[PDB]
Each structure stands twice: as C-alpha cells, then as structure tokens.
UniProtKB/Swiss-Prot annotation:
Lysozyme C is capable of both hydrolysis and transglycosylation; it also shows a slight esterase activity. It acts rapidly on both peptide-substituted and unsubstituted peptidoglycan, and slowly on chitin oligosaccharides. It is found in: Secreted. The active site is at 35, 52. It catalyses: Hydrolysis of (1->4)-beta-linkages between N-acetylmuramic acid and N-acetyl-D-glucosamine residues in a peptidoglycan and between N-acetyl-D-glucosamine residues in chitodextrins. Monomer. GO terms for molecular function: beta-N-acetylglucosaminidase activity; identical protein binding; lysozyme activity. It comes from Gallus gallus (Chicken). The keyword Secreted applies. This is Lysozyme C. Belongs to the glycosyl hydrolase 22 family. One of its GO terms (cellular component) is extracellular space. The keyword Cell membrane does not apply. Gene3D superfamilies: 1.10.530.10. GO terms for biological process: cell wall macromolecule catabolic process; defense response to bacterium; defense response to Gram-negative bacterium; defense response to Gram-positive bacterium; killing of cells of another organism.
Length: 129
C-alpha cells in the first residue's frame, strides 16, 4: 500500500509514534518519506546480504526473519514479510524497539541524512490530526 502523507501521519499517531522517545510525528513521517516513499511494499537489499523492509525499511540483520540473512537476529520476532502489510502495526511495534536501542532515530540513515535538523513539522502541515 502507498500511503498518503496525512493518512500515514494519522496511522502513526494512532499507534503511538508521536513523541515516542521524544521524536515528534513529523520526524516519523519524514523518515517514512525518505526510507520508503510511503510504500509499505518497499524492499532494498543491503551490501551485507540483509534486506530492509517496509515503510520504515527495517533490517533483517537484527529485527526480522527473512530466512536468507545468515547469522542474523529476529529481535521483533516477526517474518520480514509482516513489515510489508497495508496494516503498519508490526512496522510500528518494531520501530519502537529500534528507536529505543540506543542511537535513537539515527538507526534510519535517511532520517539522519535528510530529516534530522530540518523543519520536520512541515511533514504534518495541513493534516487533521
Ligand atoms: Na534476521
């Protein structure tokens, strides 16, 4: 599913990401924009042989099982395919663990490079939230 911007903002808010670990909703929407273009089905292979999955590009080396990432962990205890669903519940629950892991939103490289320090409130402009 390709979310609209405000549609994703409302779902992320409903699932408890606004101000989660102190990150405002606009940071999460910006991260999803640049990680996945708001596409739940986005996948991207990494050089280490892991893959990133879903709207927040969650990595199979640590967080989910895809059966092809040797020596990897599954700390969200989910198949990586669960992160491609139209229902973002699994992605949000797993993102909450990732952002709690010690480096905050720096775990999302597109957030660090394209959102961090910018006017992230712009990403929820116009939304009825
Ligand atoms: Na894994």
């Amino acid at each position: 599913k390709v979310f609209g911007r405000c549609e994703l903002a409302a779902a992320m808010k409903r699932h408890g990401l606004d101000n989660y670990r102190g990150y405002s909703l606009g940071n999460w929407v910006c991260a999803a924009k640049f990680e996945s273009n708001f596409n739940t089905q986005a996948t991207n292979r990494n050089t280490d042989g892991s893959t990133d999955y879903g709207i927040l590009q969650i990595n199979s080396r640590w967080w989910c099982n895809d059966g092809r990432t040797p020596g990897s962990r599954n700390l969200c205890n989910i198949p990586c395919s669960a992160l491609l669903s139209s229902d973002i519940t699994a992605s949000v629950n797993c993102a909450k663990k990732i952002v709690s892991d010690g480096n905050g939103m720096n775990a999302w490289v597109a957030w660090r490079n394209r959102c961090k320090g910018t006017d992230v409130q712009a990403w929820i402009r116009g939304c009825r939230l």
